[PDB]
Amino acid sequence: IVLEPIYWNSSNSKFLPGQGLVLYPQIGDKLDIICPKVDGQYEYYKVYMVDKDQADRCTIKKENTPLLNCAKPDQDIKFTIKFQEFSPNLWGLEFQKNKDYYIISTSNGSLEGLDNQEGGVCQTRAMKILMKVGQD
Amino acid sequence: TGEVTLLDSRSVQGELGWIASPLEGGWEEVSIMDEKNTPIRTYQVCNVMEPSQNNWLRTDWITREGAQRVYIEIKFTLRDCNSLPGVMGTCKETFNLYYYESDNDKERFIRENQFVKIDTIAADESFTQVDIGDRIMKLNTEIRDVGPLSKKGFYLAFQDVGACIALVSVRVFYKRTK
Ligand SMILES: *[C@]1(*)O[C@H](CO)[C@@H](O)[C@H](O)[C@H]1NC(C)=O
Numbered sequence: 001i002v003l004e005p006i007y008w009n010s011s012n013s014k015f016l017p018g019q020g021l022v023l024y025p026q027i028g029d030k031l032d033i034i035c036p037k038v039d040g041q042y043e044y045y046k047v048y049m050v051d052k053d054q055a056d057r058c059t060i061k062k063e064n065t066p067l068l069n070c071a072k073p074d075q076d077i078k079f080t081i082k083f084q085e086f087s088p089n090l091w092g093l094e095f096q097k098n099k100d101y102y103i104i105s106t107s108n109g110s111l112e113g114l115d116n117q118e119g120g121v122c123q124t125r126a127m128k129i130l131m132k133v134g135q136d
Numbered sequence: 137t138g139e140v141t142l143l144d145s146r147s148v149q150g151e152l153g154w155i156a157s158p159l160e161g162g163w164e165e166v167s168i169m170d171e172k173n174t175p176i177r178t179y180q181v182c183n184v185m186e187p188s189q190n191n192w193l194r195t196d197w198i199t200r201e202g203a204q205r206v207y208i209e210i211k212f213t214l215r216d217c218n219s220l221p222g223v224m225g226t227c228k229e230t231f232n233l234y235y236y237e238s239d240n241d242k243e244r245f246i247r248e249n250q251f252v253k254i255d256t257i258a259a260d261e262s263f264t265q266v267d268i269g270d271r272i273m274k275l276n277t278e279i280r281d282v283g284p285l286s287k288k289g290f291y292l293a294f295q296d297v298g299a300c301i302a303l304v305s306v307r308v309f310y311k312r313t314k
Binding site: 030063065066067068069072075076077078079080081082086087088089090091092093094 | 149150151164165166167168169170171173174175177178180181182213214215219220221263266267269271274275300301302304
């Protein structure tokens with residue numbers, strides 16, 4: 001089934017100050033992560049999937065590849081994750097049961113801080129998704 | 137770089153939202169991080185253990201821009217079916233490409249018998265393991281053309297008959313000065 005979409009914004013309370021948003025997606029589910037859109041006030045974010053060490057430190061590697069590049073806030077931008085164990089796509093994401101995955105953003109929310117390699121809203125606003133795949 | 141794009145699925149940042157029959161359990165839309173380290177919109181189906189597969193995917197209406205001969209570039213991958221749990225047999229390694237000319241830009245449903253078969257497209261190569269880091273160019277690229285086209289625009293459709301396949305990108309273009 002299709003899980004509730006996660007809109008990546010500062011005015012978005014799913015991200016607890018404590019440990020950020022926590023999800024329990026099951027194998028077969030899909031999830032959209034949407035950039036903040038405005039026909040208001042512009043927000044800019046590069047969103048990466050990362051490992052535990054980067055997520056704790058709110059840092060990004062220079063070879064890391066952003067799932068989402070929210071550089072166009074007037075435009076519809078979105079990433080649909082399919083929680084599959086076996087991708088028919090050579091370049092698709094694969095997940096396994098009882099393993100935790102992480103999405104973060106070390107951009108600070110402004111245009112000039114979009115490329116920030118560390119800190120940002122991961123640090124300040126706890127904008128951090130833990131995905132506990134196949135668990136309770 | 138001497139060819140005008142009539143459609144590129146990679147340019148769509150929100151969603152393609154193409155119509156599919158069945159709408160669930162067949163072709164499905166997912167994002168990937170592509171060769172250019174850019175998130176794109178893709179379509180895939182992997183019902184290899186299920187018999188009598190007839191999964192149809194159909195693009196939005198594409199304008200010709202008055203070009204009577206149009207080229208269709210499909211980049212796709214095929215997951216080796218024997219890399220999947222339980223699947224013992226011979227793998228389906230093809231899908232079928234169709235088209236339908238129409239002035240109507242909002243056809244509601246996939247009418248199977250109204251589509252004309254361009255060709256059966258074969259996977260030159262399959263894969264067994266997803267690529268983690270840097271994208272290695274092992275995707276299949278197949279180009280076909282259709283024409284002379286008579287009407288304002290047309291639809292492309294893909295029929296899966298039980299392969300484990302991902303359409304990485306679809307690019308429809310005409311050559312500007314041949
Ligand atoms: C954060 O996302 C958008 C801002 O673009 C807003 O519409 C939304 O209500 C916020 N929160 C949630 C849960 O969607």
